[PDB]
Symmetry: D2
Amino acid sequence: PTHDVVGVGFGPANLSLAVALEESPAALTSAFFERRASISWHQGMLLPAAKMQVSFLKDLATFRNPASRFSFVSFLHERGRLVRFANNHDFFPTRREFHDYLEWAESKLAHEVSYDSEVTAIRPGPGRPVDSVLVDVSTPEATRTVEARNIVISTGLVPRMPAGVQSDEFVWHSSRFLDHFRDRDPRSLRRVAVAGGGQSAAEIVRFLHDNRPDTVVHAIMPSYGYVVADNTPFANQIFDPAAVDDYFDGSKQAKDAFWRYHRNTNYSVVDDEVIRDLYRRGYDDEVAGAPRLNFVNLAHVVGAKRIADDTRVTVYSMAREESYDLDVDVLVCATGYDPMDPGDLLGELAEHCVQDAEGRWQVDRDYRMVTTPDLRCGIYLQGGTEHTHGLSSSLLSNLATRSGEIVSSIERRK
Amino acid sequence: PTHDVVGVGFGPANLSLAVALEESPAALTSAFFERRASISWHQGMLLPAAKMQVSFLKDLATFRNPASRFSFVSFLHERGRLVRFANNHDFFPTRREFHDYLEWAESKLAHEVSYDSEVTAIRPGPGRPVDSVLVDVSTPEATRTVEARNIVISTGLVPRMPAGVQSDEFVWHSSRFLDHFRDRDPRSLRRVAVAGGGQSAAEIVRFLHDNRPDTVVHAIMPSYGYVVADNTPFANQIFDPAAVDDYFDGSKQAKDAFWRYHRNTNYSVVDDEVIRDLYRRGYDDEVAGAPRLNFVNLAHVVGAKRIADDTRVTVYSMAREESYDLDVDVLVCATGYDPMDPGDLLGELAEHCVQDAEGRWQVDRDYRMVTTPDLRCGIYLQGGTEHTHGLSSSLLSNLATRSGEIVSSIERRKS
Amino acid sequence: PTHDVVGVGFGPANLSLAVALEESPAALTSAFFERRASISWHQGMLLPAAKMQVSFLKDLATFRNPASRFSFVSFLHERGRLVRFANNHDFFPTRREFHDYLEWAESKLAHEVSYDSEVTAIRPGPGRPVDSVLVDVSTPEATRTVEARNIVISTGLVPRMPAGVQSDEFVWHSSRFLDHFRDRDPRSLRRVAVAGGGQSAAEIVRFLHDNRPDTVVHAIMPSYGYVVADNTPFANQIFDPAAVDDYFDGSKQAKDAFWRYHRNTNYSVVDDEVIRDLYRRGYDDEVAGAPRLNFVNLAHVVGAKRIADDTRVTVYSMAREESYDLDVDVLVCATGYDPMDPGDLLGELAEHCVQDAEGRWQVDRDYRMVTTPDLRCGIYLQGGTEHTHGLSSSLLSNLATRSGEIVSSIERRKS
Amino acid sequence: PTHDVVGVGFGPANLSLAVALEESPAALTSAFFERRASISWHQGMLLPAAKMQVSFLKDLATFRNPASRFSFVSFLHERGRLVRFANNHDFFPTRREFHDYLEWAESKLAHEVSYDSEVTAIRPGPGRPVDSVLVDVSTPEATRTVEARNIVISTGLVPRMPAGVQSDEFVWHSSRFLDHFRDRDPRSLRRVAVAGGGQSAAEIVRFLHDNRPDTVVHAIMPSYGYVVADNTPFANQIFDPAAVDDYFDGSKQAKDAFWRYHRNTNYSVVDDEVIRDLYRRGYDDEVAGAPRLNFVNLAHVVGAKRIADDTRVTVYSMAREESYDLDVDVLVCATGYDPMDPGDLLGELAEHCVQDAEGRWQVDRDYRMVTTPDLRCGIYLQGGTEHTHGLSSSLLSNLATRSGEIVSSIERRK
Ligand SMILES: Cc1cc2nc3c(=O)[nH]c(=O)nc-3n(C[C@H](O)[C@H](O)[C@H](O)COP(=O)(O)OP(=O)(O)OC[C@H]3O[C@@H](n4cnc5c(N)ncnc54)[C@H](O)[C@@H]3O)c2cc1C
Ligand SMILES: Cc1cc2nc3c(=O)[nH]c(=O)nc-3n(C[C@H](O)[C@H](O)[C@H](O)COP(=O)(O)OP(=O)(O)OC[C@H]3O[C@@H](n4cnc5c(N)ncnc54)[C@H](O)[C@@H]3O)c2cc1C
Ligand SMILES: Cc1cc2nc3c(=O)[nH]c(=O)nc-3n(C[C@H](O)[C@H](O)[C@H](O)COP(=O)(O)OP(=O)(O)OC[C@H]3O[C@@H](n4cnc5c(N)ncnc54)[C@H](O)[C@@H]3O)c2cc1C
Ligand SMILES: Cc1cc2nc3c(=O)[nH]c(=O)nc-3n(C[C@H](O)[C@H](O)[C@H](O)COP(=O)(O)OP(=O)(O)OC[C@H]3O[C@@H](n4cnc5c(N)ncnc54)[C@H](O)[C@@H]3O)c2cc1C
Ligand SMILES: NC(=O)c1ccc[n+]([C@@H]2O[C@H](COP(=O)([O-])OP(=O)(O)OC[C@H]3O[C@@H](n4cnc5c(N)ncnc54)[C@H](OP(=O)(O)O)[C@@H]3O)[C@@H](O)[C@H]2O)c1
Ligand SMILES: NC(=O)c1ccc[n+]([C@@H]2O[C@H](COP(=O)([O-])OP(=O)(O)OC[C@H]3O[C@@H](n4cnc5c(N)ncnc54)[C@H](OP(=O)(O)O)[C@@H]3O)[C@@H](O)[C@H]2O)c1
Ligand SMILES: NC(=O)c1ccc[n+]([C@@H]2O[C@H](COP(=O)([O-])OP(=O)(O)OC[C@H]3O[C@@H](n4cnc5c(N)ncnc54)[C@H](OP(=O)(O)O)[C@@H]3O)[C@@H](O)[C@H]2O)c1
Ligand SMILES: NCCC[C@H](N)C(=O)O
Ligand SMILES: NCCC[C@H](N)C(=O)O
Ligand SMILES: NCCC[C@H](N)C(=O)O
Ligand SMILES: [K+]
Ligand SMILES: [K+]
Ligand SMILES: [K+]
Ligand SMILES: [K+]
Ligand SMILES: [K+]
Ligand SMILES: [K+]
Ligand SMILES: [K+]
């Protein structure tokens, strides 16, 4: 039984793919495999106050199909909260509500997703010129293999730690903040260091400050202060569906300009309101004579070691150009992520995949990896396309349009 | 050919009714009559900067049917502006764009509306009890009559002038501001008086100021300054579909409390952004030493008379408790509207319609007038239900739900 | 030793008076008496997030003297927080910081205030006509009497509880919320009822929600939802120094209009940010399936009784027009205040104080009580002048100008 | 008569210096020379809606003296507008009002400024070591020379045009926009091109759009859209008085970090409200079917030539790596400014003034140029200190403190 398309991973991207498949007139067979037990969308960072960075109109389908049964508005309506939500006049739902939205959509979905199913490898099918791929899936009980004419890889970002710093019992990446934090005796973390100057770092510091009144926090970051995230309407157009064509068709010179002028829309920047809330927090503490937030600016975390009951964090100060030690209970590294890389899963099919001058994967406008004639099956990427398609490649900004374009590409090539 | 339902008037209310009809599985026959040439939604007040007072989610259908082909989001999508609109992060479209939305929906609609068709009267059909009404329609050429088992009256508000002031060539109601304004030589409106302290008054004064740099404006109003319109989320709940049941089922006491505490959500109040814009305008003029906006507070317009080249406006000052005259070129009365009243159109049928203690029409929860057993056909009101259904009755706030409830009521009674 | 002026009470009002005295060229002798041990400015409501309802420019002196050593800006500068504050771009300091400001100013003040000194009575001095008053002061040790040519009464508002409800161990007025709250085992207050729809009620509910996650709160109020406080610039002008003259010189009709159109600026209304925050709180709880905030609208608290381990609150519902009981741990009444009334403290002198038609005290533009010629000494009111001077009489809005006008009045009669 | 201090230029900087002098207990003699007829603070850009980029608390004196007779609050009070202003709850006055503030303060000032007085040169006074400088002043009638123990140079920024584009009758720098614009028949500016992506460019396009309903505007800029200006409270601290010490004492590495992370607080960025207003303007025009604002992004103006009534603008497109011609009536270059340079004016005295590795002037913390021992007189810079003191050097952000620091330095050395 050979499937038209197999989806590796079930995050919002393949969920929107599943939705695009169901809404398409095309009769396409599909299968989806998720390693986790259920949809799990950055749960380690599902902090109480945390808010979507994207408008509710940027959902699973609305920009493609403005009257979808899987739209956020449909979700609100079924949950009987649409009117309530409208009264709030806020385009940004909480991260917590968006997670329910993902679950709700997955549930309404006709197709059944296979959970606890890790894709361990992708191999060429019996064939030359290869017309299918073989997908190795490992469940808790057995292992199996499925065959597909197309695959879509959407396995998400991978946590990046500071150079020379490894995860440990007392050194956590922000992606695993709540996992570790809920385990711990509160009074066990009176001193916390958080490295980074982006949204994650800011949200964690905020949470720590609001969660217990005695916790002392050290925010270590290279900038002089948090930098604001730009989502004003003209700059925000880099996230438009149409901006994908501009980026894609544009020269390397133009591509560089997107990153040069608008990196501050997405990376290493914090939302206005969180910045202002932290500042109010710090200000009221000074009035009260009880400072707790210590902002260590122009600085990098360069090392961590345990030493008795303390975590010894080594900080490099750019101002003085030297290092020093900071003793805390826990070090949280909110130091970001590296992009998706298909190269690992692909194993050997990589030999038939064409790379560019800089050594990265060539990708067509329709998100399909460029291959030699030896390979006739499709490898689509949702993620890992920053260099070809632009800043929206790993965001929720363009799920509806991308997923539809991939489904169209697959129907066209049948 | 007796229709299941005839709609009198084609504003947003009956348009949403038409949409509800098409969306319903029920096969209901209908006809709609509009006296204007096309949809015309307060065009006299379609000022350049004017913005909706209602969120885009409160459209023709979305609260009833979250995936409607007639939703504002569908409209944006077809007009290839959804992405652009989303980038703006504003829930409130311009009045101009909303007008576009109404036209767009009307066009997409299967039913063809009869324009240029004034309903002059509604009369009882044959038989007793009366099972149908007869609708008299006057077109420019001819006149005819159509029969219906149900009728929905949605003819809109009616302009209300100050007591003892009549509109003229130089005394306009705000509803007819742009009609008159575009037809006049710019150099002939150097002095304008605007009466009222509500949204209309504020918007007109703003426009006059932005429009020509030398125009002098007198804003005459009873309050000490513009009062802000409340649309904070808890108070704004009075516009919820569910709030209709609370108002309806509630005692007269409870009803009066809605009006007592939350009148300032709708009447005689101005949107925050417009108030602040007017204040910056006035402030910058003082810095420049060139004041043009004269705010005449604690005051009413009580008379107007034309004398040579001047419109002489008589103003009563509450502070001094005396009257005085103000000479201007034009007086604009932004003094509001009276509610829809089905009484005029109904004529003979009114005798079978039951009134309450205060002499107002009784209406069922499904917007159907209460009648004696002599009358079996359904008369539904979209508008004119402030006293039974609450503050949302004349607004866009609840179009989707109301229209659906009326269509359901009609399908039910057929069955 | 006869003083030019004695001040009864030391809240912001008399502290601005003390400042006005020090800044005046006039050599005036004065004494101030406060019952409390130190300045205590609504400490029972100094909640963590609580913010001033007045701009930092409206401080002890700035509107009268733009370069005062007692301005809020001076305070920030000395506390080394001016630059930090400026970066925040918020005109509204916290209530906590403002308290700091009051203490700082009081300290910087040359004059020494007499604390733990309750003024028990004011009596006529020797002579006829009366040229001085005698002020009876009770300290913890002794009692004494001081003599003054003028007296300024600024004793603040007095808590008002719902009719038929009395303070008790489990029934608190909002003014004494933190006093009782700190004094209670946290697991003893799992169910709280808060009566009222104003700023205090909103702030207390917000606090309860944020303080422990398990607390269930009943917000009981007559409106359908919190009503927003109007502070938009035109309406906000009723708080201007100049608005005092407009209100004062205006007819009773005009005075009524101020209250009729602009009570939404001050009484029974909630700040936009607080309303918004409460609504988000309620919304997120619904998403989580763990509702805690129960909004009981169109309702009054009409009684309270203690029954075993429960405070039984009797609630009247306007919608159903019937009463029912509500069992909670504590009832907090955030039901507002009655104005300052100089009369209690005046005793014998009040005979010579002229009242108006409605039986209230007549007051001159300079805040001086109108007396029959039998009295020659000056009695000034800071507070208790809502009926003569308008809505700013009990606020921080106009401290600088009011205090200056009273000092001027006193200097000019000494002359 | 040798003066303790002579001020070259009378903009906000030397005006705050004059104020600091008057408020100081020190009896210092001074003289100020301004070339223009009166205070003239970017009048070419005093557009109707234009707003200060700095809070009213950042005025001539308030951060140094919180109860100054020259504060903005004192100004409002005397102009009987304090209450009105307070009601409006806006920290940012209009540029127009701020200009009145400057005139008001200059007028209240006891000292009399010499206008129509251009400083043409600064020369060493008699003796070795040099204990004084000689200041050559050219008036319309005569020329004279004054002697000073110290000099403070505050001559402001100098307009910078695009490479290969010269000012002309139809090519204006933004600094001279209103000068040219008022002198033109309205029906002769139906097509305008504006080059630049900063505050000036945005403000001019806004004005053009709002001024006449038929004007067509081409906004040419290198970014994909306007980038928002960061003035959130943590990042905004780079403008703090204390941030000057951090920048000054910090290493070259730290200094670079200020510019790398926070250049978007000041250069090539546009205020949130202005961006939003332009976007609404463009949106409403699309609804009306009458587009007038053409945003030409990822582009530079590279040339201009007059060709029979059309100003022919040559535009380089980064996307297509191609150039092309655009015909308009006027080209406005809102392409920024170069910093103040004391070198111009100093002439012979440069020899006793020490440069750094990169060839820039060395300056002490108190804004005094570093000189060899052959020069003893003080040369102070208000402006031209970006490289030693940081981003606030040319701004209004820190007038009160800087001016006080300089007055103190002079009193201490006397
Ligand atoms: C806290 C946070 C941080 C973020 N960081 C960034 C950032 O740094 N840069 C940026 O551009 N966007 C970032 N995002 C956006 C983020 O990518 C996504 O919003 C969301 O995860 C969308 O991408 P996705 O569809 O690929 O889902 P991905 O959620 O991240 O997850 C898809 C699934 O792949 C599964 N998976 C992976 N490998 C296998 C396998 N071999 N077998 C089976 N299942 C597998 C995972 O278990 C997962 O459920 C962040 C968002 C949040 C909330
Ligand atoms: C400037 C402005 C002012 C407003 N004033 C108020 C106010 O004061 N109070 C309030 O609650 N809301 C007010 N509104 C809201 C207004 O009611 C609604 O936005 C909207 O028009 C209501 O929809 P409707 O369909 O019921 O009435 P409508 O849009 O007013 O009217 C529907 C149609 O009925 C037609 N019609 C009337 N009589 C006949 C007939 N005999 N035969 C055939 N057709 C007929 C009309 O020509 C019209 O096209 C105002 C809105 C604006 C923009
Ligand atoms: C939580 C809160 C609630 C408020 N409620 C209202 C309201 O309902 N309506 C309104 O218009 N404004 C209200 N305000 C404003 C309040 O009145 C002012 O902020 C402020 O306290 C007014 O100045 P006073 O100096 O007039 O105040 P009062 O501060 O309260 O100061 C009077 C002082 O005199 C002392 N005193 C009293 N009697 C004697 C005596 N016999 N002898 C010696 N000392 C005495 C008192 O101990 C007290 O310290 C409220 C403010 C807050 C923060
Ligand atoms: C529209 C606008 C654009 C701006 N552009 C920038 C920018 O690109 N980068 C930045 O950091 N800040 C910029 N600023 C800030 C600007 O520098 C400041 O606001 C302010 O003017 C700086 O203070 P100053 O005293 O140095 O002013 P400068 O006003 O410009 O004052 C110098 C004065 O000295 C006079 N002068 C010059 N030479 C002589 C001479 N030889 N003899 C006598 N008098 C002389 C000049 O005529 C002038 O009046 C801008 C501000 C505005 C409003
Ligand atoms: N609620 C939400 O939806 C939500 C929540 C969290 C994140 N996000 C999104 O996820 C994306 C990434 O956010 P992120 O904050 O996790 O990653 P990020 O934006 O790349 O932030 C990483 C930060 O860590 C700094 N850093 C790097 N190495 C360091 C070191 N050795 N020591 C100290 N600091 C160091 C970086 O400095 P440099 O600038 O020099 O690299 C940068 O400030 C963003 O698009 C963000 O908006 C969304
Ligand atoms: N979506 C939009 O663009 C838009 C535009 C306009 C209106 N609307 C809405 O539709 C409704 C229309 O209201 P409106 O603005 O037209 O008017 P309005 O709110 O009904 O009130 C009219 C105003 O005139 C005053 N007034 C009455 N008699 C007067 C007299 N004799 N002299 C002077 N002033 C007098 C009233 O004061 P009193 O309080 O004393 O009566 C009031 O200020 C509002 O609810 C509004 O929100 C929407
Ligand atoms: N109301 C006010 O107080 C006010 C008004 C105006 C300005 N200002 C202040 O003055 C400072 C700068 O103002 P500004 O806008 O005049 O200068 P600016 O911020 O330096 O802006 C210069 C702009 O010109 C662009 N550019 C340079 N060469 C170009 C070319 N050949 N073709 C097209 N574009 C070109 C730049 O692009 P690149 O980034 O690639 O160089 C940049 O976007 C700011 O701090 C601003 O806030 C204040
Ligand atoms: N980092 C995510 C930002 C979302 C983006 N501003 C958008 O509106 O698409
Ligand atoms: N003035 C119209 C009121 C709109 C109402 N707040 C609503 O959201 O439906
Ligand atoms: N472009 C000038 C900005 C100045 C800075 N935001 C400040 O407050 O000083
Ligand atoms: K399908
Ligand atoms: K399912
Ligand atoms: K149908
Ligand atoms: K149609
Ligand atoms: K004195
Ligand atoms: K001096
Ligand atoms: K002078």
